[model samples]
Target: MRGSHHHHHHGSAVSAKIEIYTWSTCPFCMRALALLKRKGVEFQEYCIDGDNEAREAMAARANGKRSLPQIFIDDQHIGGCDDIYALDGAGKLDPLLHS
Candidate 1:
């Protein structure tokens, strides 16, 4: 699946929106959400476990990886749980969240 590219809307008054695709029992997914909560980040969560259609849509946005817990920040693909943590560690996560 190829990730969709969105053109940034300049000067648009839009609140940052975050979306996470996850399954119920994925530990990495849980940890990813925990971090977001810890940072006071509000996001839309999609639980795709056993939901084939949704999972396929998620995969389409995840570069063909149907792995649980795919994340997007303001329509920009930010990859999976570990990728999020890495951004946090690098001090990039907060700015993105609050953007």
Candidate 2:
């Protein structure tokens, strides 16, 4: 889940819109959103718990992964909770958040 911070230097050129596919009661899902809030990034959330159609749609976008928390930063696929934490560790999260 650790990738090079290729977009680290991107500033305002990146989009600010963040999106997350989550389900209620999932600890990882909650943790993901918590990090987003901690960073003060406004985001759109989809609580697709038990919604088969919605979940399928999200899975399609997520490369067939049916995990509880699928996250994106300005349309860039940032993977799940661990992936996100890695981004933060690499100092890439803030640039994407503020951009």
- Highest TM-score: give the candidate number: 1
**How large is the C-alpha RMSD of every model relative to the true structure?**
9.4, 9.4
Say what the RMSD of model 2 is: 9.4
**Best lDDT among the predictions, by candidate number:** 1
- Each prediction's TM-score versus the true structure: 0.83, 0.80
- Write down the lDDT of every candidate, Cα atoms only: 0.88, 0.85
Candidate 2, residues 1-99, lDDT tens digits: the string is 498566667775544778899998899999988998888767899999789999898888898988879997767788999998898999987877863
lDDT per residue as tens, model 1, 16-86: 89999999889999999899888886679998888999999998988988987999998999999999999
Off by over 4 Å in 1: 1-13
Question: What's each prediction's clash count?
Answer: 1, 0
